């Protein structure tokens, strides 16, 4: 078997070339993207086999640097994230190849052999092994939004495992890879629009936990900014590094993204006070129903759909609606009108019975049935209007005046109807409790027209006792009327 019998120093220059990132070498001739040592290489010493052993280890390192060079090649020859990743990866080799070319200088111009260049390259062959595992998760994968999210999330996970020179590498490799997101996030905030390419961002107008703990403050600031125009963040994170790594350290980035948010949401609410006002639009809504409406209903006591309109502009129907502009349309939604209409219908029936039994002025036996009834309806009316329709109303106004958000203003509002529809018993338990109050209201209609008498108290004393013996189950706020 013939062999080439290469000299000694030649091998080192080969390895320096291979680790540099070139191809077509007399040694380490790759075949299928996998570098492999030749078979006829031999030195005067090392019995032709140890050489195949020592080269095999360096060959394993060539694979790590050849595959990466193939990756950078397939990017040069608008993803805007891999470009930010390769530029970080490529930036490492330049600071690394200088350490290689420098060694070759001391070869042409001190003795140097194999066992010396390897030990001299220990803090490099260590840092290189990490990349073979970090990049292995960025090559094993089809959509552009899953290939970039899964990559950027692998870094933030791989650093927390390493929490020193290896951490300085991954960190400097991280910042240059999150630069695209940190740009569009800032750009979306101040410029009020999301400028994405190939739907790279996760919000396609499956999530990286990097920015999750503050994500809610982003979207609620982005969309809020877009509704304002119709009426350098990365250069901040880096200076923070100048003045406990990436977990508490990252917890100091958000003050840059949170105070910026606080101005935006505080700006929309500020301009919403006048100029598409809301506080005067909201109060008048709950004012034109729930005086003015006194004369309106009295005309209905003594029909036509146009007759009421001229009256308003001056058994269970009368659907009322309102006109809402666009800046407030999102607050007072369409399904919000019905709830406001719901409580308006029921409220009038109480005003009806209360006014029907009050407008007028065994013969006198009817009066003992008047006070026994006029008081009861008067008691219920004092419960709905005063201790419900004015308690939550007094609290609601004290809450809206501290609105600091587009979203929470909907919640504080939606937490006003869905509770006022519960205290006023209209949602559930209707055929169990509410019907009792409904059927006794028919006594306010029958007794009003007639102006049989003994057969009313037998019914009245029954249904009223039926009312208390049913409501006795008391959920807790019902006791404010249970006294009578």
């Amino acid at each position: 078997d013939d062999r080439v019998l290469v000299t000694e120093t030649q091998v080192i220059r080969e390895t320096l070339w291979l680790l540099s990132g070139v191809k077509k070498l007399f040694i380490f001739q790759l075949i299928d993207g996998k570098v492999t040592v030749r078979n006829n290489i031999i030195v005067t010493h090392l019995t032709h086999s140890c050489l195949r052993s020592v080269l095999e280890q360096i060959a394993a390192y060539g694979q790590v640097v050849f595959r990466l060079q193939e990756f950078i090649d397939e990017v040069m020859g608008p993803f805007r994230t891999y470009q930010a990743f390769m530029w970080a990866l490529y930036k490492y080799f330049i600071s690394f190849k200088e350490e290689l070319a420098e060694i070759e200088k001391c070869i042409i111009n001190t003795t140097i052999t194999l066992a010396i260049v390897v030990d001299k390259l220990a803090p490099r062959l260590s840092q290189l092994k990490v990349l073979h595992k970090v990049f292995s998760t960025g090559v094993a994968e089809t959509r552009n939004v899953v290939r970039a999210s899964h990559l950027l999330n692998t870094l933030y996970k791989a650093i927390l495992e390493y929490d020193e020179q290896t951490v300085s590498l991954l960190f400097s490799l991280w910042v240059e890879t999150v630069r695209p997101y940190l740009q569009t996030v800032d750009e979306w905030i101040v410029h009020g629009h999301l400028w994405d390419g190939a739907r790279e961002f996760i919000i396609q107008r499956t999530m990286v936990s990097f920015l999750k703990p503050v994500l809610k403050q982003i979207i609620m600031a982005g969309k809020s900014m877009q509704l304002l125009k119709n009426l350098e963040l990365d250069d901040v994170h880096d200076p923070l590094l100048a003045i406990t790594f990436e977990l508490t350290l990252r917890s100091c980035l958000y003050p840059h993204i949170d105070k910026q948010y606080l101005d935006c949401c505080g700006n929309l609410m500020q301009t919403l006070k006048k100029d598409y006002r809301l506080v005067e639009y909201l109060q008048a809504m709950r004012n034109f129903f729930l005086d003015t409406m006194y004369d309106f209903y009295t005309s209905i006591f003594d029909q036509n759909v146009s007759f009421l309109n001229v009256q308003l502009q001056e058994l269970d129907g009368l659907t009322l609606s309102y006109k809402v502009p666009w800046p407030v349309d999102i607050v007072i939604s369409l399904e919000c009108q019905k709830i406001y209409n719901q409580v308006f219908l029921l409220l009038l029936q109480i005003k009806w019975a209360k006014y029907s039994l009050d407008v007028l002025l065994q013969i006198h036996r009817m009066f003992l049935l008047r006070v026994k009834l006029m008081h009861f309806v008067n008691s219920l009316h004092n419960y709905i209007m005063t201790r419900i329709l004015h308690s939550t109303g007094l609290e609601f106004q004290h809450q809206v005046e501290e609105a600091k958000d587009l979203d929470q203003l909907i919640k504080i509002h939606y937490r006003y109807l869905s509770t006022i529809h519960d205290r006023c018993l209209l949602r559930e338990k209707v055929s169990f409790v509410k019907e009792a109050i409904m059927k006794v209201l028919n006594l306010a209609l029958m007794f009003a027209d007639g102006w049989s008498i003994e057969k009313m108290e037998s019914d009245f004393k029954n249904c009223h006792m039926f009312l208390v013996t049913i409501l006795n189950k008391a959920f807790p706020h019902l006791e404010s009327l249970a006294l009578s």
């Binding site: 010493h45 090392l46 086999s49």
Partner: protein
């Protein structure tokens, strides 16, 4: 052949030095160029190479998981560094002089034949017993007390870098309230403590100190932050773990947070006011309120309890607080009486719970707030029987207009003296123990004392009031329900005890007087204060 060997000792086996997966590095067979004797010294030398290969293979494999295993291998390369370096030099000398022989290799590597075979078993114990977590910081320490100086100077380095992990986590927790861990390595896992993983040389005393200084931050949600970071970092530079110094940095941190916590626990959050609320209602401090509540909510509790009585009393208690001309919408809805129903007289299940606020949530746990309830159950009973008993007296004098009816007061007064003065030693164990609890507060600036002074104050009440002492508590209990029968007997009628009442009257005196003297033998530590009052006129002395 020399450069051939110096690679075999590096981790690269060849034709001359074959490699076997079980035995290790060894020479193949005889060779003409080598002397037939030198094959032995090589085989003795290869005992050094087999270690380094099995070392670096384990180091790369990283195998089990955990930071304390990652750091061990990270440090294991540091002690191995002089071996690599001292091998590079052998190339230098041999390159110069062409006459050296293998015997010179044996002289240079003498110490390494002594360092590896001992540190090897340290690795073998790990891979053979699944030593996971902080238990490594003891397994390596139990072998650090060896006799060989180099071995002692080697493992101490590994322990010096392995402590860097704990020192990283320890400082991250004692000042940021969170523990950076995802594999349950730290000895902390409402948090708790771990003992089956806690180090050996670390005492439990400081372990308790750590568990408190951290939870006091996580619950709590300047210059006292950075300076301690420099202290913790300083210990990481120490090449020898000195427990005598580990405590001087922990205790100062402990005293500072405790001093800071005491400031809030008393000054900003008024504990004295809250304790004043507890003494009044739990311990019947405001007895004038409970006599009216008992006066009203009486008939609705002698009947067995049902699902409705729970609300039938909360309104009565509310009717009571206004009936004593006390008006305060604060702390009035915070008191909610409970009825232990469905898991029997109604009084036996009565109780009072307290929805504590946020700051005192740490001082008043459901445990300590439960022992308070037991005192309220018992102290109310004595109050119930006393108020009931005196009403009978309020009727005897009211019954002034039988030679046997006079036996009533001759028993009533006896039942009175034993019971009325029994409510004494109560106003003199409450107003004495409480007066110490309030004094231990305004004395020590530390907060740790309060958690112990208050805890000891509570244990005394259970001990002083004979609640825990079973024999006396099971004899006086018979005296309690005894008066219920007697007082009822006088109230269930308005005439002389003739219709089998006298026949029932003489029943209890045969038991009461027996129960009376039975207690007397029990008393004959703390009973001296009680027995002195009953024995002032020496009536029991003649008994």
């Amino acid at each position: 052949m020399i450069h051939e060997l110096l690679l075999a000792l590096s981790g690269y086996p060849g034709s001359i030095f074959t490699w076997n997966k079980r035995s290790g590095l060894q020479v193949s067979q005889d060779f003409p160029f080598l002397h037939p004797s030198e094959t032995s010294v090589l085989n003795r030398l290869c005992r050094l190479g087999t270690d380094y290969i099995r070392f670096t293979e384990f180091i790369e494999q990283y195998t089990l998981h955990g930071i304390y295993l990652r750091a061990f291998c990270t440090g294991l390369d540091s002690v191995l560094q002089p071996y690599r370096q001292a091998l590079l030099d052998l190339e230098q000398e041999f390159l110069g002089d062409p006459h050296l022989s293998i015997s010179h290799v044996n002289y240079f590597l003498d110490q390494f034949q002594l360092l590896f075979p001992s540190v090897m078993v340290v690795v073998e114990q790990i891979k053979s017993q699944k030593i996971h977590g902080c238990q490594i910081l003891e397994t390596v320490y139990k072998h650090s007390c060896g006799g060989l100086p180099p071995v002692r100077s080697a493992l101490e380095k590994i322990l010096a870098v392995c402590h860097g992990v704990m020192y990283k986590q320890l400082s991250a927790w004692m000042l940021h309230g969170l523990l950076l861990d995802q594999h349950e390595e730290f000895f902390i896992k409402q948090f708790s403590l771990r003992v089956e993983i806690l180090p050996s040389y670390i005492p439990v005393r400081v372990a308790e100190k750590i568990l408190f200084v951290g939870e006091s931050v996580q619950m709590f949600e300047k210059n006292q932050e950075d300076t301690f970071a420099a202290e913790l970092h300083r210990l990481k530079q120490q090449p020898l773990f000195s427990l005598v110094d580990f405590e001087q940095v922990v205790d100062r941190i402990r005293s500072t947070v405790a001093e800071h916590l005491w400031k809030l626990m008393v000054e900003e959050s008024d504990l004295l006011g809250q304790l004043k609320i507890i003494k009044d209602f739990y311990l019947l401090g405001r007895g004038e309120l409970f006599q009216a509540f008992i006066d009203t909510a009486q008939h609705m509790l002698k009947t067995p309890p049902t699902a409705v009585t729970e609300h039938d009393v909360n309104v009565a208690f509310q009717q009571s607080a206004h009936k004593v001309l006390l008006d305060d919408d604060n702390l009035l809805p915070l008191l909610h009486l409970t009825i232990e129903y469905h898991g029997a007289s109604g009084w036996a299940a009565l109780g009072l719970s307290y929805k504590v606020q946020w700051p005192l949530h740490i001082l008043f746990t459901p445990a300590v707030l439960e022992k308070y309830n037991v005192v309220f159950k018992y102290l109310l009973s004595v109050r119930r029987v006393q108020a009931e008993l005196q009403h009978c007296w309020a009727l005897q004098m009211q019954r002034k207009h039988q030679t046997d009816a006079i036996k009533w007061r001759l028993r009533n007064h006896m039942a009175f003296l034993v019971d009325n003065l029994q409510y004494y030693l109560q106003v003199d164990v409450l107003e004495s123990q409480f007066s110490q609890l309030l004094h231990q507060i305004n004395s020590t600036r530390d907060f740790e004392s309060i958690r112990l002074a208050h805890d000891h104050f509570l244990s005394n009440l259970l001990a002083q009031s004979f609640i825990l002492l079973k024999p006396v508590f099971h004899c006086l209990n018979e005296i309690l329900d005894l008066c219920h029968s007697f007082c009822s007997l006088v109230s269930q009628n308005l005439g002389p005890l003739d219709e089998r009442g006298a026949a029932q009257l003489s029943i209890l005196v045969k038991g009461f007087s027996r129960q009376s003297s039975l207690l007397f033998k029990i008393l004959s530590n703390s009973d001296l204060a009680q027995l002195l009052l009953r024995l002032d006129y020496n009536k029991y002395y003649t008994q």
